[PDB]
Amino acid sequence: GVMDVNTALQEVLKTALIHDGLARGIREAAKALDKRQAHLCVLASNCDEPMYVKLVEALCAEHQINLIKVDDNKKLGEWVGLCKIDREGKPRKVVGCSCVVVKDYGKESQAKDVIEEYFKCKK
């Protein structure tokens, strides 16, 4: 592989946006996890709600679903796509996201391969 581990999530998130397979927010994520249609989850390390973290971690663990940690919620939202692009090209309007669930993968072999390798290395 060539792409970095931490920067390889953008392709998957963009393709899930295009193919409409993203559950955004704690309520949608929890509902998808209960429906066990989820494939993987994305968690934001920077947060002020310990109960949020405990609920997401326990839901991921008790549904045998892999979990990923991200630095901050604003970057997570920028990856997710809840932003508007300015004339120059920067996202002045960003709304952060604390938890994301990927319901359908994008049909990309390279993007999925690195994440699967990372999950296998974690196990």
Partner 1 sequence: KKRKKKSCTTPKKNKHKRKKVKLAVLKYYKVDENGKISRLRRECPSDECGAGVFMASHFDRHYCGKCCLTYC
Contact assessment for residue 3 and residue 115, using Cβ atoms and an 8 Å cutoff: no
Alpha carbon distance 43, 100 (integer Å): 7
Integer Cα distance of 18 and 20 in angstroms: 6
Q: How far apart are CA 82 and CA 96, in angstroms?
A: 8
Stretch that binds partner 1, among 8-16, 59-67, 76-84, 108-116 (CB under 8 A): 59-67
Q: Which of 41, 24, 28 is nearest to 80 (CA)?
A: 24
Give min distance, CB of 26 to partner 1, in A.
Answer: 5
Q: Based on CB atoms, which residue is closest to partner 1, 36 or 92?
A: 36
Residue 35 sits in the site that holds partner 1 (CB under 8 A): yes
Regarding 62 and contact with partner 1 (CB under 8 A), the answer is yes
Pick from 58, 72, 90, 108 the residue near partner 1 by CB under 8 A.
Answer: 58
Where along the sequence are the contacts to partner 1 (CB under 8 A)? 26-27, 30-36, 49, 51-52, 54-55, 58-59, 61-62
